[PDB]
Amino acid sequence: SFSSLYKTFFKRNAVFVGTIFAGAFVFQTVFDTAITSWYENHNKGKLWKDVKARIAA
Amino acid sequence: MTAAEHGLHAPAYAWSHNGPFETFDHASIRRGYQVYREVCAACHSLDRVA
Amino acid sequence: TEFKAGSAKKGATLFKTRCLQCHTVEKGGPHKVGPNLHGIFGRHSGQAEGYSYTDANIKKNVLWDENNMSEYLTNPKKYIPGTKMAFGGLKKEKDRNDLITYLKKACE
Amino acid sequence: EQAARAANQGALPPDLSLIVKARHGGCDYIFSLLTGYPDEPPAGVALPPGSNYNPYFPGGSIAMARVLFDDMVEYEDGTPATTSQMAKDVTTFLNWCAE
Amino acid sequence: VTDQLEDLREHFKNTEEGKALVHHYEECAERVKIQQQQPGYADLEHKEDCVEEFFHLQHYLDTATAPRLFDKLK
Ligand code: HEM
Ligand code: HEM
Numbered sequence: 528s529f530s531s532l533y534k535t536f537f538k539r540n541a542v543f544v545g546t547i548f549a550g551a552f553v554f555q556t557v558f559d560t561a562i563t564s565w566y567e568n569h570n571k572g573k574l575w576k577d578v579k580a581r582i583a584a
Numbered sequence: 585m586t587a588a589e590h591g592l593h594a595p596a597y598a599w600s601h602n603g604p605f606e607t608f609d610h611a612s613i614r615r616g617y618q619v620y621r622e623v624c625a626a627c628h629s630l631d632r633v634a
Numbered sequence: 635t636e637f638k639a640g641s642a643k644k645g646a647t648l649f650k651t652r653c654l655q656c657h658t659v660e661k662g663g664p665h666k667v668g669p670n671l672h673g674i675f676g677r678h679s680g681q682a683e684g685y686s687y688t689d690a691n692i693k694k695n696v697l698w699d700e701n702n703m704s705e706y707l708t709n710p711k712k713y714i715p716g717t718k719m720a721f722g723g724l725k726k727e728k729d730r731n732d733l734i735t736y737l738k739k740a741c742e
Numbered sequence: 743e744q745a746a747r748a749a750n751q752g753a754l755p756p757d758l759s760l761i762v763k764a765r766h767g768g769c770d771y772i773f774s775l776l777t778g779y780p781d782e783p784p785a786g787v788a789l790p791p792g793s794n795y796n797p798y799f800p801g802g803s804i805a806m807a808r809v810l811f812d813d814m815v816e817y818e819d820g821t822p823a824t825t826s827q828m829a830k831d832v833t834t835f836l837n838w839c840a841e
Numbered sequence: 842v843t844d845q846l847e848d849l850r851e852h853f854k855n856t857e858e859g860k861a862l863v864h865h866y867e868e869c870a871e872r873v874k875i876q877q878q879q880p881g882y883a884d885l886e887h888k889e890d891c892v893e894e895f896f897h898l899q900h901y902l903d904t905a906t907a908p909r910l911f912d913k914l915k
């Protein structure tokens with residue numbers, strides 16, 4: 528949160544509701560994908576997907 | 585309460601699903617079903633599992 | 635002719651830990667989860683008086699001998715499908731041979 | 743229930759769908775129970791006819807006998823079916839059944 | 842391949858602490874074996890057992906085998 532960086536996008540105004548709501552939509556998507564990828568990778572080998580693959584014979 | 589009455593304390597094994605970030609080991613679940621079917625099922629029901 | 639005589643001592647331990655929970659061997663012994671096994675050899679399946687067998691066991695009508703006993707103990711429900719007997723099975727032939735050896739002696 | 747008890751000398755084997763959450767100790771208790779049957783009870787302990795000794799069970803006298811023995815099951819994936827391996831696997835399956 | 846828990850338990854029964862504990866249980870067992878041979882044992886109401894000694898032994902074994910067992914399993 529650098530003053531100059533904030534000012535380039537919002538010019539001394541607080542973030543408006545419309546932008547907050549719009550930003551919440553994007554966050555929801557990116558965050559979920561990020562968490563899911565981290566979680567599945569952390570448990571690699573234990574998941575059904577990994578076990579189903581192992582059963583190739 | 586005597587030790588016998590209470591029962592021996594069960595020690596802590598390192599289950600791979602222990603811990604906030606850990607899922608179950610699904611290969612172990614699969615194998616466990618086989619043990620249930622071939623051994624436990626003769627006397628034990630699993631009524632709430634569809 | 636697959637059955638080979640083994641150690642009756644080792645067979646007694648197998649009976650204690652694997653069969654005693656549901657069976658008794660002494661003459662005139664009481665029935666439990668399974669019927670008393672005294673006089674089982676040379677007799678047909680499902681004939682011990684006082685015990686309620688399944689139709690699957692009775693209809694099997696197996697004249698019990700050392701060899702079919704060996705095949706039965708390997709996997710009970712495969713030999714007599716529809717039987718109440720809940721047993722894990724003795725995969726090793728040495729275990730069967732020893733267990734049967736003890737059983738033969740127990741009802742002589 | 744009548745048939746159940748008749749097949750277990752009067753005792754009723756509980757449904758296992760929630761056993762892991764229905765016992766203090768959870769997976770540890772279930773596992774320790776299945777692998778905790780000694781060959782003989784401690785000296786001076788009179789075991790009620792039909793009972794089995796297991797230190798992890800309150801009172802030490804349990805109507806269930808040891809049921810897991812080495813290699814009694816042939817694992818599809820090749821895993822050696824030892825008593826502890828089977829106990830570990832079935833307990834994990836039961837934890838999933840409960841949760 | 843023998844049972845991994847059995848192996849670990851056998852190993853720890855052999856440590857110094859494991860041997861002292863088995864000794865204490867075995868000593869109690871012998872003492873109880875003698876009491877039973879005595880006349881009128883069935884009528885005492887204060888019969889000694891070795892559950893406590895067995896528990897001390899098992900607790901020690903569990904403390905050592907519990908954190909090690911799963912590394913040996915699949
Ligand atoms: C590996 C397969 C099995 C599992 C996982 C299992 C698990 C359990 C558990 C967790 C209990 C509850 C003990 C408690 O109240 O704390 C129990 C009780 C019991 N089980 Fe099993 N069991 C298995 C196989 C069997 C078999 C094959 C039989 C029948 C031959 C059997 C008969 C019983 C009985 C009679 C009880 C009641 C014990 C009592 O309340 O005194 N179980 N079992
Ligand atoms: C290796 C150990 C065992 C041996 C040698 C053994 C042997 C036998 C034999 C030869 C029979 C046939 C009886 C007849 O036709 O008269 C039988 C029946 C039976 N056994 Fe076992 N048994 C063993 C363990 C068990 C166990 C652990 C249980 C209880 C959980 C059990 C439950 C029964 C029952 C319920 C029957 C009646 C079968 C039916 O009516 O369908 N047995 N057993």
Ligand SMILES: OC[C@H]1O[C@@](CO)(O[C@H]2O[C@H](CO)[C@@H](O)[C@H](O)[C@H]2O)[C@@H](O)[C@@H]1O
Pocket residue numbers: 650651654655779780781782783789790791792793794795796807808
């Ligand atoms: O009801 C089981 C029946 O088995 C016996 C056989 O001696 O008990 C032995 O085997 C059990 C199976 O694990 C043990 O729990 C028990 O401690 C051991 O003595 C009978 O005593 C018992 O009634």
